Design a protein around this ligand. Structure first.
Ligand code: MN
Ligand code: MN
Ligand code: MN
Ligand code: MN
Lengths: 198, 197, 197, 198
């Protein structure tokens, strides 16, 4: 068993004009592949340490597992979160969206603001709190994955690492964050919401 | 399986620097709890990693560092103390003088850094295998020195309030100063020798 | 200048939940130290910012958060406790039931989160002005709730070991459970009303 | 009194082929300018809070001051750290370099490795410990400035935020980190070392 780089649900140029094909190819083939490749090696070293009962070595490996494992989790979710033909939120999801945010417009505004405000590299997420049964906006630093680090089940994420938009948008992160809503795969988000309530 | 080590001395053997009650609680309750939790968390982590459950493996990280670190830190700490801990080896004293000027200077610097810890944590005299020099470092909570910094621990000062409160109350500096009276230089010297291998 | 507030009760008035000695040390030593240090650090920060010394201003940040936070947190904490603290207001109980199902559920959730704090910190019942709902949150060390999260503090549980060790020793959960007996619901209710303005 | 965007010691295309003119212009006119502009506003708000004795507000402003103030400190140092004609380390500096690293080659190797290993956005620095009287390699996250956060006096820094190299180097951060040594302003580093020993 090993982790593998998932195929994108679309071709590399399918998200143009919102995300360029060069960003998509680099992001997928170089950035995500690197996280996966490192993840496999780190997981092996971690299993080795844990099997030995070597607590020092297991702790030492934690930042690398979080970063690469998180990188893999986050990008895997991200690819599915996007579509040229996203559709619209499910009836169940919109009820909750209206309940916790008032409207879809309020949700998009709040997620966009929080995401743009990330200092350095990171992610913005729409998440579901299983315990509170409530929808939440959260941000994560670097590749810290949402669920593992907060308990929130990720529904929709926006990658704001500079590699996610710089070639196209340069320093103008807000233009990317607002434009990404045009390609939000609501069908996928709705599916994730349904699973998160199980 | 990880186990609570026996102390190298009786619980009252470090009085009047650290009381019987502190030693007993610190060993039988605090360290024991870290060990027990460590075993539980290590088992869960083994399962998660075995099955390639990266989410679960990441989720367990704070608990493993805290409890695993607690086990590492306290295991070292007990061996770092003694009723009569002697003096640094010739080799260690040479290194101390080289890196800190004098034993008094080392004590002063490590004590000051340790006292300055905000909240719970540890003060450490450590050896850097890369620079081949001694260094003062502090760690938050139960973050273990070597796993998190690469520095090999030689002498640690626990400044979690449970390490001194029953006796010293708020006066952490007095505990940090007094612990030098029971520093087990035989052990610190042995750790220094091993760190150089 | 920042000053140590007088307690709303005598030092032994919270017995047998929190001892006279704990209250006296916690107030006269721990809180007093945060206040004294806060005044020193605020003065240095005023000077640094006045002169546009960004380096110095940044360097003072851990000390200001720790000591300023200590002052904020303990100031609230004293008012959150009482010998006879009554019951939540009608309004607060409605909000508690809405957000947590029951007062018992709130107590359980906040107690569990607070007990789970690794190292030194605080447990808080807070009000989110954005969501207009009650929330359980924890803070590390002296990180103050509102400045760091935006949540308005309503009821806090200090789990720094100095808050309970002399009496409860390692058994933090018993202290966290017992503190509900002296929760000053009059004050929590007043804070809730003010948070809604 | 206010903070201002310093002029670069050279023209925008002067660091080509090692750093492109588009990177330099964006980095200076957009990224650094943003930090300065925000810094001025945040410092005013902080002075207001501190003058009032409003501890909550002063604490609340800390991340924004660290980030923007740090951004300003770091980039200000960075521009001076580079040159088409850097020269060579001073006699005093090289003695210390040899003492703490064995050689210049060992220093460059170690700083390069640490810098490349930064997870997310950050900086790699050659720093001077005033207390230990020793040279150290350190890294900083996001815009955390070296001296304020560690006590180490910065001598030479390498910006590894993706905006510092992506347009040119794409994902290949190591090529940028190794190539930046070609433009290291040793005269400036030597000057900083001399001041740090005072
Ligand atoms: Mn990415
Ligand atoms: Mn301890
Ligand atoms: Mn306290
Ligand atoms: Mn930069």
């Amino acid at each position: 068993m090993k982790h593998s780089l998932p195929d994108l649900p679309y071709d590399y140029a399918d998200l143009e004009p919102v995300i360029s094909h060069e960003i998509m190819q680099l992001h997928h083939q170089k950035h995500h592949a690197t996280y996966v490749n490192n993840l496999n090696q780190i997981e092996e070293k971690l299993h080795e340490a844990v099997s030995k009962g070597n607590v020092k070595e297991a702790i030492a490996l934690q930042p690398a597992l979080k970063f690469n494992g998180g990188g893999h989790i986050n990008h895997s979710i991200f690819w599915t979160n996007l579509a040229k033909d996203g559709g619209e939120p499910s009836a169940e999801l919109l009820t909750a969206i209206k309940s916790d945010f008032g409207s879809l417009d309020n949700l998009q505004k709040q997620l966009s603001a929080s995401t743009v405000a990330v200092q350095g590299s990171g992610w913005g997420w729409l998440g579901y709190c299983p315990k509170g049964k409530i929808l939440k906006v959260a941000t994560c630093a670097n590749q810290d994955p949402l669920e593992a680090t907060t308990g929130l089940v990720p529904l929709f994420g926006i990658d704001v690492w500079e590699h996610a938009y710089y070639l196209q948008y340069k320093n103008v992160r807000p233009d990317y964050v607002n434009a990404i809503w045009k390609i939000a795969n609501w069908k996928n988000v709705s599916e994730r919401f349904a699973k998160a309530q199980q």
